[PDB]
Structure formats: C-alpha cells, structure tokens
Design a protein around this ligand. Structure first.
Ligand SMILES: Nc1ncnc2c1ncn2[C@@H]1O[C@H](COP(=O)(O)OP(=O)(O)O)[C@@H](O)[C@H]1O
Ligand SMILES: Nc1ncnc2c1ncn2[C@@H]1O[C@H](COP(=O)(O)OP(=O)(O)O)[C@@H](O)[C@H]1O
Ligand SMILES: [Mg+2]
Ligand SMILES: [Mg+2]
Lengths: 373, 192, 42, 373
C-alpha cells in the first residue's frame, strides 16, 4: 500500500540500512572510504579513485581508510555523501526520492551536523521526507518497553538516556566519547607490549577483528589478572591475514575493562557503570526503581561476553541493597537501534512526524530543530 | 422482537400518563396549600417549570416519547443500544428532577407525594424493562469484530503493541474532549 | 433544547463503547506478547 | 425504591465519595491534578494531557502535581471540575444527573466558592438537586450526638464548631488555616536539618507519607525533647521509594506539635487546644459543661497517635478542675464527616432540604445562601 520508509542507522563504525517493517537490516557494511596510496602501473587496472564499504574492506592492503564519522560527528561531508550514495544505489539499490528516510543521531550532537544531514537529504537526494531520531529512543522501541535507561555504546559514542513512560529526561542524558574505536586503539597500544606492531589503518581493522573475536569482560578484574599472571588458560591464539599466529593473554579482558576504567586511556571520566548510576540519580526519586529494573543495553560495544554480569555487579554495588537490578541484553542488541527505527517508521502515528520537503523549503534547514527531539 | 417492546411501549405510555396525572394532582395540592403561586402562563412555551411541576411532567413525557421512538429504531435497525440507553438516561434525569422538586416543594405526608414517588418508580422500572427488551431484541447486543491477531516478526508484533496503545491514548483524549463538549452543550442549554 | 444534549450523550456512548473495545483489543494482544518477544524481553 | 444520594466530601487533600446508606466511602483518592513537565519522545506513550487521582499518585516522577483546593477554598475551577468528572465517571461510575449530591464545605468560606460549586453542579453535571453541608455538623451526625464541639482538622482547614441540642453557635465558630498540608511543609523544612532535601511536589507526597506513617503527638513536649536528646529509642527508619533509608528522631513529634504551637511556622494564632477552649468560652455559660464533656475530633489530621491524650491534658489544664472533659476520638474519625453525610443523606426529614434545579433556575446561585447554613 503505502511506500515503505528507509531506516539508515549511520553509526560511527557501521552503516545499517534497510526498509521499515523488516526485522533485520538489509545492508550492514563498514562506514569507511578508502583511497589508493600507491602508484598504478597497470593501464587496465587501478583507475577508480575511492572505494566505499565492504569493497574497501577487501582492498585494505593498498588503501588508506578513513572514517567520515568521528565520535558520532560527521567530519568529512564529501565522504559521508559518498557513503550515502553507496548505501542507496549499490547496497539497497533503491531510489531515495520515493521513500522517506529515517536517520539516527547520538544525543548532545552539534546542531550543524543535523542541519547538514537534513540539507544533504533534501538537496542532494531529494527524499520526500526525513526524520532524525535519537538512537537510545529507538533502542527502547526495539525492546518493547516504554520505561528504562538505555545504554547505547556504538563505535564512536557511548550514551545513557533515561526514559520513563515515554518521557525523556534531557538533563539526565549522559554522553561519553569512550567507545569501540578507542578500545581498538588501546588494544593496538597494548598489543605493542607483546611485540605485535599494528600501525596502518588496515592493521587497525585487523585489530578490530581481533577485539571482536577474542576480547571479553572479566567479572572481577583483579582476580582475572592474577589468574592470567599465574596460569596460561586465558591465552588464546589468532591467525593473522599473513599467516602469522599471535597469542594474547590478559589483553583479552584488559581491553574492554577500559569501559569501566577510562583512566587506562587517560580519560578523567568515570566508567559506564558509574555514568549509568549517575544518570539514574539525576532522575526524579520516584522513577529510580523502574530505571534500576530496566537497564537496556544496545550497540556493538555491548556484545562483549560477560559484560551484562559485570554491569549488574557494579550497579548492584552502587545502588541500595533493597533495589532489584536487571540488565536487559537481548542477543540481537547489535541491531537494536535499527530494529527500533524500523518499528517507529512502520507506525501509522509516526507518519505525521515526517519532516516533509515542503516544510524544508519554507523554513530552511533550521526546521529540523523544531520537529525532532 | 418488535411486539415485546411495543407492549413495553404501552406500559411506558400508561406509566407516564399516571405520572402526569400525579403531577397535576401535586400541582393542585401546592396551590391549595399555598406552597407556590400559580401563574398559568406558558413561559418559554413548554419550558421546564412554566406553571410549575406539570411543565416538567410534559418534558418528561416528551423525553420518554423520544425513548419510545428509539425503541422502534432499535427494532428497525436505525439506532444503537447506546442510543436507547442514553435516551433512557435523559428520561431518568428528568423524572428524578421532577420528583425531587415535588418532594422538597410539598408536604412529606401528602398523598400526592406518595402517588408521585410511586409513578416515578413505575416509570423508571418500565423504562428499564423497555431498555432490556430492546437490547435483547437487537442482534448487535453482543457483537465484537475484534479477534486475536499476532505477527511472527518481532518488528511486526511490537508495531501491533504500539499501534494498539496509540489507539488507546487517542481514544482516551477524544473521550476527554467529548466530555468537555457535552458539558459545554449542557451549559449553553441552560445558563440562568 | 434536549436534542443537542441527547446527541452529545450519543457521541459519549459511542466513544465509551469503542474505548472498551480498544481495552479488550490491547489486553488480548498483550496476552500473546510472549510469543514474539525473546526471553530477556519476556 | 428511592434513588440513593451521592455524598462527596472534597477535602483539601482527599476526595471521599460514595452512596447514601453505606458505612464507608466507595472511592477515596487524593485530589491532585498532575501535568507532565518533560518532553515526550516515544510516540507510543505520553499523549495524555493530565492525570487525576491515583494515576497522578503513581506517575509523580514525571508530573507537576497541583491541588485545586487550597485552604478549603477552590482556586483552580478547571482542575476541580476535572476531579469531579473523574470522581463521577471513573471512580463511582454513575451518572450524576439521577442522584442528588451532598457536598461539604468548611465554615467561614468565601461565598463565591459555594456559588460556583452550585453553578457547576447544576449547569455542568445537571444534578437533580444538591445540598452543601458544614463538615462539623456531619461529624456530629456521624458521632451519633446532638451536643458537642467538633474539632475537624482536614488537609487545609482546622475548624471548631460548637453545637448544643442541634443548634449551632455561629459567633463561636473558630477557623484556623493551620492543617495537615502546613504540617507536611514544616516536616520538609525540618527534614532539611538532617540533610534530607525534599523539594519537588512528588517529594512533598513522600514527606506526607512519612508524616502519616511515623509522626505522633508527644504527651509532654519538653520531656519528649529531653528523651530524644538522651536516647535514640525515638529514632525510627523509613525507606524511600528509591531504596535510601532515612532515620528521623525528634522530628516524629516535632511536626505534630505545630498543631499546639503554631508559632513554629510563624503563625500568630493559638494552638488547637486554646482555640477549642476559646470557642467553648464564647458559648453561653449554661452549655459549657456539655461541650466540655463532648469534645468530638474528626479529620485525618486528628489521627496522630496520642493526640487525644494531649488534647485532654491541655483542655484540663485550661478548664476548671470541676468540669469532666472527654475527648471522643473514634478509630474511624478520618471518614467521620463523610459517614455523617451518608446519615444525613438517608434521613427522610432531610429529603425536603434539597436545593432542586427548579429553585436554582428561578432564583440563581444565590439560593444556596438561603437554604444552606
Ligand atoms: N562481538 C563483539 N565483541 C566486541 N566488540 C564488538 C563486537 N561486535 C562489534 N563490536 C564493536 O562494536 C562496533 C560496532 O558497533 P555498532 O553497533 O556498529 O556502532 P555504530 O552505532 O557506530 O554502528 C565495532 O567498532 C566493533 O569494534
Ligand atoms: N494516620 C495519619 N497520621 C497523621 N496524619 C494523617 C494520617 N492520615 C492522614 N493524615 C493527614 O490528614 C490529611 C487528610 O485529612 P482528610 O480527613 O482527608 O482531610 P480533607 O477533609 O481535607 O480530605 C492528609 O493530608 C494527611 O497528611
Ligand atoms: Mg549505534
Ligand atoms: Mg475533612
């Protein structure tokens, strides 16, 4: 009947794009732009100027890879437009000027980011309508809840947003720049300790894969460190793309621990558990119980084995003993934001919140600050 | 079906005629006892208390007349059960107003007072009998088109939940609006 | 005089009725929400 | 047979509604109107504009709560009409246009308050009839007495009314704004002394619950102060909705003492015992003995443990030693007014005292000043 809407979660690390009403993103690919850094010598080859997405992930040996989005803020608009073009025409293979597009954004982002996103969607792609949602709200939509504190930890931005009965508490929104990419950089730094030298951006991708394959969160950090220093049971091996086999021990759990001890990377902020507790304590006293019982986690950085148990133990240590604390960590939480976006875009009621290109032409890009939270 | 309500319609007519006669007798008692002065002037035509209690009685009759009409529509398929019970609600309000007015404006030991109370109770019970007879006669008494619906997609089911809850909230808000509209139309009808 | 009053009661009663239908619908759909929600969503 | 009448005691802080002849109110709920004070971000929830009664008491975290009745005087007529709508159609679930309505009002209230009450009940709800009674007379009816001085202390008004053999003495009627809500505010002010900060209206409700569950009237104030200073036995603990535990000591009896020493909140008036004694002294000398022997206490504020003993001691110290002083404090006094109204609504003699719609239409709202005391 009605034309389906496009849901495009433009994360810092990955792009998850698909159609509203589907239960899984149709196109999930890294948000990187690669450019050749060597000299082409074969006349029939080496002519394209830039590679986007999975293709750049296959040619990283001869490419410089750049993320157009850094800490949830789009820094290279030409690269971001290239990625959007690749998403619409190559991955989804649809015409964007017939489907309203739902975009996501981290809270407390600069206004110019959202305004430029709107201007690009309306002037370059000519979408019929668009909307910029907050990733935590969509994550709450995906869990079938209306009350809870969403901890969304993506590639470049972590943030806690508490919501009670559909009402957000903007004064209690916490944002922390520590995220997956910083964990990857710290893993590179601590892998230099065993003699493994990863420097180039391609080696950064290799280290990211190592992190996704072998890292986990320790229940008790000190006991885990003692066990690693005493026994070798925690040492796991991993085969590099060049065939070399590396063996990592405590670095498996010393990397994600930065989420709870940001001082490991020289950041003064508190860990994710303390930020969650502070966000809860900034809320009204009457809603703290429901927030304590509805801790929702989402994003790739929350896919670490055993992170839910560590979060539960830390918050239990912080919260009063009487309170019941439940960490909701669905197995598909890496796509929670996109699933919530699809749910929201499939709603009949949401159909009235579309920023139509009629309103854009009379109000300019500033209209996005009057119709989106 | 239609015959049962028609017998109940005749019961309505008899009860309301007895109510009118009782109201006339009460008005006769009031003037003889000097409870309230008789101005035999049709202020605002029928009005509500022109010449006193009997005017109310007339409107009460008028009210139940509409009720009777609704009954026919209820047995012909042009009115809903809620329409008939709303007309019955108006009838009950009118007879309660008249009964309390005569009760406070007349002696407690008055024979006309006892006749008035008996007639009002008879009108109310016969109205309820007509209401239940017409509701049972109507085939739409217990008819609901809602049924169990579910979607395998996790996106689909949550969409159902949110859409249902949105209908919930919007209907509740519209109920608030409708109550305000009814209050406004009552104030406009009478504002002294 | 009373026609507007009875009409307002008409709309009030219609909307009460469909509100109760909405109650039953939402309740029955909420009854089966366990089937398409995972264990953590229960 | 005859249609039962509605008895609606709309106090400053509680609405108690039921049907004539019943021995207990069918619906008792706070008379509060709550409005959301945050931004709704999830479309599925957060569409209702206002919450009334227990719903607002359950959603206080995201609401600003306002009492439409302040010091027994209705200040927000839209909110009061909303509360009456909720009472009639949600709690009692009856059509008001078939039942005569008995409302209550404190003595010495503004005339326009009563006139507006009549106009709303007759032109918005179209009740067949109404009657506005004095709460103290209803309390005396509930006590099964015809002689006594009623001390009714509600949420916002505390009034003494002496009645002798069914005759009221208007010149001896005493009114004092010091009441339960002022006690709650003073309890908040003195709870700031231990480091507990309650500011929002929801925190005011929490403090009201603390007062209802932990406060009592000391027999001797100075001895109680000395005991609290010497020993920690008086100290008691209460659990906040967020799990925190607060311990209060002398405050438990310091808050209700304001009833007898209004100067604690800067009020020049005398305590309730002195006001009662003055009201008795304003009466004829021939009836003072019966009033001394028939002290009737009603209202929620008179539910403090040990208030009857303290009142008896104070009045005994004030009255001559020959008089026999008896404080009548039934365990169900918090509903006494309503109970009395029920009795008054069931009397056959009272059926001629109704203000019918005919009289209202022919005389206007001013008729309420000719048929109700
Ligand atoms: N199984 C896993 N274990 C640990 N980290 C992971 C895992 N899967 C993904 N990540 C990290 O999460 C990031 C992806 O998070 P994502 O949800 O895509 O955030 P964004 O909102 O930026 O798209 C990647 O950078 C990766 O380092
Ligand atoms: N058990 C109790 N102990 C002390 N105070 C109480 C108790 N129960 C109620 N109250 C106080 O009494 C007030 C309610 O009094 P109420 O009789 O409802 O007066 P109103 O006529 O204004 O409704 C509340 O504000 C509350 O603070
Ligand atoms: Mg994300
Ligand atoms: Mg009271």
């Amino acid at each position: 009947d009605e034309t389906t809407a496009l849901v495009c979660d433009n994360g810092s690390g990955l792009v998850k794009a698909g159609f509203a009403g589907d239960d899984a993103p149709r196109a999930v690919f890294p948000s990187i732009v690669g450019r050749p850094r060597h000299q082409g010598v074969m006349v029939g080859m080496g002519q394209k100027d830039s590679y986007v997405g999975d293709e750049a992930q296959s040619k990283r040996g001869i490419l410089t890879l750049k993320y157009p989005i850094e800490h949830g803020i789009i820094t290279n608009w030409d690269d971001m437009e290239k990625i959007w073009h690749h998403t619409f025409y190559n991955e989804l293979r649809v015409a964007p000027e017939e489907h309203p597009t739902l975009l996501t954004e981290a809270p407390l982002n600069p206004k110019a980011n959202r305004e430029k996103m709107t201007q690009i969607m309306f002037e370059t792609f000519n979408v019929p309508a668009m909307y910029v949602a907050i990733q935590a709200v969509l994550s709450l939509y995906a869990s079938g809840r209306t009350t809870g504190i969403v901890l969304d930890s993506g590639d470049g931005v972590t943030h806690n947003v508490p919501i009670y009965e559909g009402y957000a508490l903007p004064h209690a929104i916490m944002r922390l720049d520590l995220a997956g990419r910083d964990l990857t950089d710290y893993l590179m730094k601590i892998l230099t300790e065993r003699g493994y030298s990863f420097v180039t951006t391609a080696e950064r991708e290799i280290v990211r894969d190592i992190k996704e394959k072998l890292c986990y969160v320790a229940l008790d950090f000190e006991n885990e460190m003692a066990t690693a220093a005493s026994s070798s049971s925690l040492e796991k091996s991993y085969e590099l793309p060049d065939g070399q086999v590396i063996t990592i021990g405590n670095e498996r759990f010393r990397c994600p621990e930065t989420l709870f001890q940001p001082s490991f990377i020289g950041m003064e902020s508190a860990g994710i558990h303390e930020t969650t507790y502070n966000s809860i304590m900034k809320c009204d006293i009457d809603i703290r119980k429901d927030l304590y019982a509805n801790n929702v986690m989402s994003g790739g950085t929350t896919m670490y084995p055993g992170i839910a148990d560590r979060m539960q133990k830390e918050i239990t240590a912080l919260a009063p003993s009487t309170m019941k604390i439940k960490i909701i960590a669905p197995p598909e939480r890496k796509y929670s934001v996109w699933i919530g976006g699809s749910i929201l875009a499939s709603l009949s009621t949401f159909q009235q919140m579309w920023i139509t290109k009629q309103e854009y032409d009379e109000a300019g890009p500033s209209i996005v600050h009057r119709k989106c939270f | 079906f239609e015959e049962q309500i028609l017998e109940a319609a005749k019961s309505i007519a008899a009860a309301t005629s007895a109510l009118v006669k009782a109201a006339s007798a009460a008005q006769r008692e009031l003037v003889a006892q000097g409870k309230v002065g008789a101005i035999p002037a049709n202020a605002l035509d029928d009005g509500q208390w022109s010449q006193g209690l009997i005017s109310a009685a007339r409107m009460v009759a008028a009210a139940t007349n509409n009720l009777c009409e609704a009954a026919n529509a209820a047995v012909q398929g042009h009115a809903s059960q809620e329409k008939l019970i709303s007309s019955a609600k108006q009838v009950a309000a009118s007879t309660a107003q008249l009964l309390v007015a005569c009760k406070v404006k007349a002696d407690q030991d008055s024979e006309a007072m006892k006749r008035l109370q008996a007639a009002g109770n008879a009108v109310k019970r016969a109205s309820d009998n007509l209401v239940k007879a017409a509701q049972k006669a109507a085939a739409f008494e217990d008819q609901e088109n809602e049924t169990v619906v579910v979607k395998e997609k996790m996106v689909g089911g949550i969409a159902q939940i949110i859409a249902a809850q949105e209908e919930m909230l919007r209907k509740e808000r519209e109920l608030e609006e409708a109550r305000k509209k009814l209050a406004q139309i009552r104030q406009q009808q009478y504002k002294f």
